[PDB]
Amino acid sequence: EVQLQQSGPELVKPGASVKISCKTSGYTFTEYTMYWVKQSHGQSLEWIGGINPNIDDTTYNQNFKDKATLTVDKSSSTAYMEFRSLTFDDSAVYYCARDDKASFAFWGQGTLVTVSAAKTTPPSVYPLAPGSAAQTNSMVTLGCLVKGYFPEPVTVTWNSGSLSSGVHTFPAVLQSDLYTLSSSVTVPSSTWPSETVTCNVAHPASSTKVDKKI
Amino acid sequence: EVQLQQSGPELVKPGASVKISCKTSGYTFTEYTMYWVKQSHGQSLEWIGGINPNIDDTTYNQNFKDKATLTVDKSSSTAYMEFRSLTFDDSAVYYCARDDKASFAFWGQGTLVTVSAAKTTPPSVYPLAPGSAAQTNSMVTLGCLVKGYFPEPVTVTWNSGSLSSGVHTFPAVLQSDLYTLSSSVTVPSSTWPSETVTCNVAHPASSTKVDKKI
Amino acid sequence: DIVMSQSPSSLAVSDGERVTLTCKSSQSLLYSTNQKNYLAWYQQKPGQSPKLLIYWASSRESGVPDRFTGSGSGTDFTLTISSVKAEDLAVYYCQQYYSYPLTFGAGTKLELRADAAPTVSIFPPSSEQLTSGGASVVCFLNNFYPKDINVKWKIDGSERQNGVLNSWTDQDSKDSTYSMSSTLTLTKDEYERHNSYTCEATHKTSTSPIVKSFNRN
Amino acid sequence: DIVMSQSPSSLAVSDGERVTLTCKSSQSLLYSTNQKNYLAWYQQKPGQSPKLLIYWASSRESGVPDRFTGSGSGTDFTLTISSVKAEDLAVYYCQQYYSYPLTFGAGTKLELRADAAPTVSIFPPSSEQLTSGGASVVCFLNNFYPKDINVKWKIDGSERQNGVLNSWTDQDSKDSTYSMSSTLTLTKDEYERHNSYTCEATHKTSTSPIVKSFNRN
């Protein structure tokens, strides 16, 4: 019925300015107002502000004072949002919500905006193996650590995707401006160590593919 | 068309019961008729029976008398076929025959029911090498024996699947409720015995993989 | 501004039962002449956009199944679901349109049932880690319920709170369980000055904590 | 009941040659009121399910290529294929809809051509086999044609059928030929009491059988 389009992920340096756009199609832009909502910590939502295109009505939150300024485009039927003085707490998923009536509202797919002082580096992966000669469990679990990579995401498969079961992907944590993740996959005791399994990591940004056989 | 969704393979023992379900979609289940066909010794089809789900009329062949029953389910639109007093001659591939129009009869994927009394055992690999020091033929043959495994099948690879040429994989034979297969490959006289190969087998049921050098 | 509270934070539900959510406001959201109350309920699917369910707290959106209904006026608000489904896993929000600035809710989440526990995930460090100059020991938590757990780090019988990296995952779509990874990093000469590394974890259904350890030499 | 017969059992055809199949029943299957002969022709691909092609013997089913033309009435029936293709390799069946129980055909499997010359490759029993308490003497027969071949097992000049097992796979698509394995099992006590082990096979193209032997010493 309607299509709300925005930009993609941006990689910006602290101190610069980023512009977020919200595309409007299927309806007149001069009638219904547009709002912006900030999603922090993956769950809690924060209200950014709102703007009325025709009458130039602008109201902002007490947190976004002297930060978020809204600008509308009457010719191309789209909205613009730009930020100033980006800090480390300014990385959040952004939405542009249309206000139709009091009953129901429209939402967009969102823009992932992260800001850090960083340089892209090939991921350094190390194999991990249990140091015990024997165990009481019929299962043997393995794993490999992925450290020193940037930016997100990183796709990690196991044995060219032959084993899709028992895989667990842990979210990355930000330490020293670089993310680190980990993975663990269960393996029966009747195979290891009579065969070798590999960790296949893919980093499309740096175009690096390395395999570590355990 | 019609999507016929059957069950997976069943492993049972003689004297027990087994249920085979056939799921129909896309048309009315209470309108058309249902049939079942068994494939004996792999080249020969056998007619089990048929059921009309509307009036719940059940008819069977003379061989299948007092053995298999046919029940239908109106809510889930599924056909049930249950067997009683199984024997060693009841292991075959079963088909779900749905007769809609006389022009073309719809058929399912098939159901492999293997009924035997056995315990899961890891395979035993016996390598084979020629006993002659020299030969007039420029092509030398090698072989690998896999005995004492269950259930079937097992994937056999040569040199970690690196050599795909001249690979002859023979079907399994049943002796004393155990399965046995053989494999032979053609090797040139230049690499043999200049380089060594290996016989790699994989058993998905027992998760036991054995490697032997030839 | 008018702040709203939500209770409880999370609750474990089964398939086919009733779920009740509550949003309380510090002030009256009612408007006199139209006998209406300003609120909007939200349902946000993971990786998707938020969507509205109950408008004016008294009525259902067009296109939303009949299992989503709500009652209440003034201060209290109630969101009741008659029969939950497998696609009902989401995070729910409640917003007030009464006054600017617009204030939001804390959010709620539903879980499943139950009883998963791990045993030993311990991985000793490898030989390639020390070549880069650092050292890292990790403890994993897999197939455990509930998500609430307290991980502890014991080095030579001493507690160490720095360098602990904890990571939690979402809920599995198969066994409906959780996965947690705890990573402890340190330098090269500190790893050689210590031998035994004990990783402590305390779980609710167990009357005693699981104590496992390994030795460096 | 009513029985049907298909002749012959197998046919070896090349690319471009026409093939005809014959299904003969025990009595006329013609029905007077409908004036239609009730019979079914099936084609079962290897590893796949069979499918119906010619219904009531007089017509082609929609989606079936033009090369399949059904004919015949009364007792005799004929299935004519104008030009065979690479996807035409399968087994065919014949079903009658006339009376219960429904009778199925014996099946006819197509082959390829031609001129494959076999060879004999003998292997001695391994070292791990005699340790397990037994021995196996096998010789592989590969790259031969047609599929009809007879192999004999003679121990110390005496012919023995005890423990003779054969393994026959399908036709390899690369060389358009067949491969058959023969297995002869015996215990460790019988291996020490005998010396010469021979396997003899007879082929139509060869005027004399090919013999191969080995010694225990």
Author numbering:
A (entry chain a), B (entry chain c): 1 to 214
C (entry chain b), D (entry chain d): 1 to 217
Article excerpt on this structure:
To investigate the molecular basis of S5D2-mediated cross-variant neutralization, we performed cryo-EM single particle analysis to determine the structures of SARS-CoV-2 B.1.351 S trimer in complex with S5D2 Fab. Three cryo-EM maps, including the SARS-CoV-2 B.1.351 S-S5D2-F1 (associated with one Fab), S-S5D2-F2 (with two Fabs), and S-S5D2-F3 (with three Fabs) states were resolved to 3.5, 3.3, and 3.5 Å resolution, respectively (Figure 4(A-F); Table S2; Supplementary Figure 8 and 9). (E and F) Side and top views of the S-S5D2-F3 cryo-EM map (E) and pseudo atomic model (F), with three up RBDs each bound with a S5D2 Fab. The epitope of S5D2 Fab on RBD would partially overlap with the binding sites of ACE2 on RBD, leading to clash and spatial hindrance between ACE2 and the S5D2 Fab. This is in line with the high potency of S5D2 on blocking the interaction between RBD and ACE2. The mutations occurred on the RBDs of B.1.1.7 (N501Y), B.1.351 (K417N, E484 K, and N501Y), and B.1.617.1 (L452R and E484Q) are not the contact residues of S5D2 Fab, thus explaining the observed neutralization potency of S5D2 against these variants. However, the T478 K mutation site on the B.1.617.2 RBD is located within the binding epitope of S5D2 Fab. The surface property alternation and side chain enlargement induced by the T478 K replacement in B.1.617.2 may break the interaction network with S5D2 Fab, leading to reduced S5D2 binding and increased resistance to neutralization by S5D2.
